[PDB]
Amino acid sequence: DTLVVTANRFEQPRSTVLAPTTVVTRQDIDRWQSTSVNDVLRRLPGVDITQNGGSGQLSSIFIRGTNASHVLVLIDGVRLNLAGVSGSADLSQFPIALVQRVEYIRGPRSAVYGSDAIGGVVNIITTRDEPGTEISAGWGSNSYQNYDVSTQQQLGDKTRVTLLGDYAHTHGYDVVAYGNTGTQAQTDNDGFLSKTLYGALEHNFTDAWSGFVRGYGYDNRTNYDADTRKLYSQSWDAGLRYNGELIKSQLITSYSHSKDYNYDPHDSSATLDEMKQYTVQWANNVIVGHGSIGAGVDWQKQTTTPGTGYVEDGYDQRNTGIYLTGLQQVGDFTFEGAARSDDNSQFGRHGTWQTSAGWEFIEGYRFIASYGTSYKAPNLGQLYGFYGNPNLDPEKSKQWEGAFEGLTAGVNWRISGYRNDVSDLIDYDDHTLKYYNEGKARIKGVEATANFDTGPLTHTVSYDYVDARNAITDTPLLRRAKQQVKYQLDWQLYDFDWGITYQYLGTRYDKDYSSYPYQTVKMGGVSLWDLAVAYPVTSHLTVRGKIANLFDKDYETVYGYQTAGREYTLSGSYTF
Ligand SMILES: CCCCCCCCOCCOCCOCCOCCO
Ligand SMILES: CCCCCCCCOCCOCCOCCOCCO
Ligand SMILES: CCCCCCCCOCCOCCOCCOCCO
Ligand SMILES: CCCCCCCCOCCOCCOCCOCCO
Ligand SMILES: CCCCCCCCOCCOCCOCCOCCO
Ligand SMILES: CCCCCCCCOCCOCCOCCOCCO
Ligand SMILES: [Ca+2]
Ligand SMILES: [Ca+2]
Ligand SMILES: [Ca+2]
Ligand SMILES: [Ca+2]
């Protein structure tokens, strides 16, 4: 699709969004045959994701060079629950079987959404309009197994129902470990089992007035090393929507409750984390000329259990923000903007804002200037942990960005450079065994994308340069590749749909924890290749297969944790 929602909360056509943005749909994923959300995001511009091995293992998403907690991940609009305890997003446990759509807008959006939107935003949408029931599942190269039953149907005039179950499981391959593990080893394939359940009830009172109720949860258990971690999550949403010709409005609610254990192996000696986050937001938008204007109020409650986050007492964190959005188109120029004020139960008030203007100085070509401001809340652990500091302020970012975007000779392209200066970075002082706000980073980047067709061939290429450094010491930051290259090539032929995807993961610096003291290591970086194919046996059956890492490239995204290697997958789906 070409109209997202994530930018200002309500539908608008992407072309109207001045910030770089990307959309992935459910048809994409099925094609891509992704078995995990990281797989999907790893493909898109500006994304650098690392992982302690295969599937289920902790992972980190760095967008355009920012720390891993500097990305806001929303599910169906709402701040990712899993991110709550740690103050940092990791989709590693989120069920891909719930993903219907994803919308990703890079750059700051705190001025719309609050804390965490620094690098950009990620909005995983779990909703579809696609009636019928579908059965599917697959088999693969490490006992990977999956099966899943889905269906959406009508329940009479104006009400529709959605139901879904899915179970995927693939014991692993040992992810060695290094640094961690200590004395012995872990000669054991570290599996992950995920079982999901999802149900939605959508209701139109009228042609404009709508309503819904969803409920979903998953029970995961993905063993790691140097320990089996068992995770339960459930979330609940319900809202009303009015969508008129001129006036749009939404009122939304949600509650998610998570329980994240790790044993064992076999009680006593295990840290359970438990969070309950409560959200209510109200937002309006109206069409005004060739533009819109908008505002909403947005409230949050997160309360944690004692022991959670390795923090002494339970905590009850509250936040309320209020913001204003605008888009106007005039003549050849475009203006878009937002401003927010947030009142946090801990640090108080902090406001934020962004503007961008574009000039289409010649048909099909557009020059865009953006300046935007964002923030990142301190987390429990910096606040109330053994080394805590309850008076921390938020970490603060300023970004400037220029772009040229245009359609020339059958090819759509864009090229941006941004600068991101982060400040008040929450860092630990050995001197006082406390955290304080003090660090700086400067990030210097370049994104270039392009898609275009040449015969039955479709190309979708992207390139990123990230110079992310500690601004005081002038040194590169770790865990981040300076350069990635991503290319997808799609084409059909006889009745076979093909896709080859190529990635080059640049060279990164990390640390070697196997042993103290902990030395920095330079990882060379590689090229990876996956190949995929599907074929409609009938009109109802489609069979696919995939070779991932088609050559057998050995590499790590995190020093010491072994990655998959070449895996095979054979899969199918049956719609009726
Ligand atoms: C009705 C409020 C519209 C602006 C809300 C966000 C504005 C935040 O800073 C924007 C101002 O700085 C540049 C002003 O010129 C264009 C503002 O953006 C036009 C919004 O469509
Ligand atoms: C919706 C429009 C919001 C406009 C945001 C941009 C304007 C921000 O003003 C200046 C930013 O820094 C604010 C402090 O102003 C100067 C502080 O000087 C006094 C120091 O004690
Ligand atoms: C309708 C809600 C309006 C939200 C706009 C405020 C967003 C944050 O303010 C703009 C950026 O921050 C500038 C404010 O910082 C200066 C604070 O000045 C406070 C002096 O009381
Ligand atoms: C940084 C981006 C620079 C953009 C320069 C584009 C300027 C003009 O580009 C296209 C102009 O059209 C001429 C190219 O071929 C014309 C095709 O039109 C067919 C009949 O005239
Ligand atoms: C308008 C898009 C800028 C195009 C990037 C390639 C051309 C660069 O020209 C000079 C190179 O600048 C060196 C810095 O490179 C990274 C800087 O990125 C953004 C920091 O301002
Ligand atoms: C990129 C400079 C040329 C002007 C834009 C060309 C359109 C780019 O589309 C292709 C992008 O795919 C890889 C681009 O690599 C070229 C630029 O990398 C330069 C970094 O300074
Ligand atoms: Ca192991
Ligand atoms: Ca193990
Ligand atoms: Ca035009
Ligand atoms: Ca120091």
From Swiss-Prot:
Residues 13-127 form the TBDR plug domain. It is found in: Cell outer membrane. Its main location: membrane. One of its GO terms (biological process) is cobalamin transport. Induction: Constitutively expressed. Primary control of btuB expression by cobalamin occurs at the level of translation initiation. Residues 1-132, 154-158, 203-206, 244, 288-289, 332, 363-364, 406-410, 453-455, 492-496, 535-546 are periplasmic. Ca(2+) 1 binds at residues 174, 186, 188, 190, 225. Changing residue 3 to P: Inactivates uptake. Residues 130-576 form the TBDR beta-barrel domain. It is a multi-pass membrane protein. SUPFAM superfamilies: Porins (SSF56935). Disruption phenotype: No longer takes up colicins E1 and E3; colicin K uptake does not change. GO terms for molecular function: ABC-type vitamin B12 transporter activity; calcium ion binding; porin activity; protein domain specific binding. A motif (TonB box) lies at residues 1-8. A motif (TonB C-terminal box) lies at residues 559-576. Cyanocob(III)alamin binds at residues 58, 60, 67, 85-86, 226, 271, 479, 513. Calcium increases vitamin B12 binding affinity by a factor of 50-100. (Microbial infection) Colicins E1, E3 and K inhibit cyanocobalamin (CN-B12) uptake; E1 and E3 inhibit binding of CN-B12 to cells while colicin K inhibits a later, energy-dependent step of CN-B12. The chain crosses the membrane at residues 133-140, 144-153, 159-170, 192-202, 207-223, 229-243, 245-262, 271-287, 290-299, 315-331, 333-343, 347-362, 365-379, 396-405, 411-420, 435-452, 456-471, 479-491, 497-512, 520-534, 547-558, 564-576. Ca(2+) 2 binds at residues 188, 190, 224-225, 227. Residues 141-143, 171-191, 263-270, 300-314, 344-346, 380-395, 421-434, 472-478, 513-519, 559-563 are extracellular. GO terms for cellular component: cell outer membrane; membrane; pore complex; transmembrane transporter complex. Keywords: Calcium, Cell outer membrane, Ion transport, Membrane, Metal-binding, Porin, Receptor, Signal, TonB box, Transmembrane, Transmembrane beta strand, Transport. Involved in the active translocation of vitamin B12 (cyanocobalamin) across the outer membrane to the periplasmic space. It derives its energy for transport by interacting with the trans-periplasmic membrane protein TonB. (Microbial infection) Acts as a receptor for bacteriophages BF23 and C1, and for A and E colicins. Cyanocobalamin (CN-B12) in solid medium protects against colicins E1 and E3. Does not act as the translocon for colicin E3 (ColE3). The translocon is OmpF; trimeric complexes with ColE3, BtuB and OmpF can be cross-linked and immunoprecipitated. Interacts with TonB. Belongs to the TonB-dependent receptor family. BtuB (TC 1.B.14.3.1) subfamily. This is Vitamin B12 transporter BtuB. It comes from Escherichia coli (strain K12).
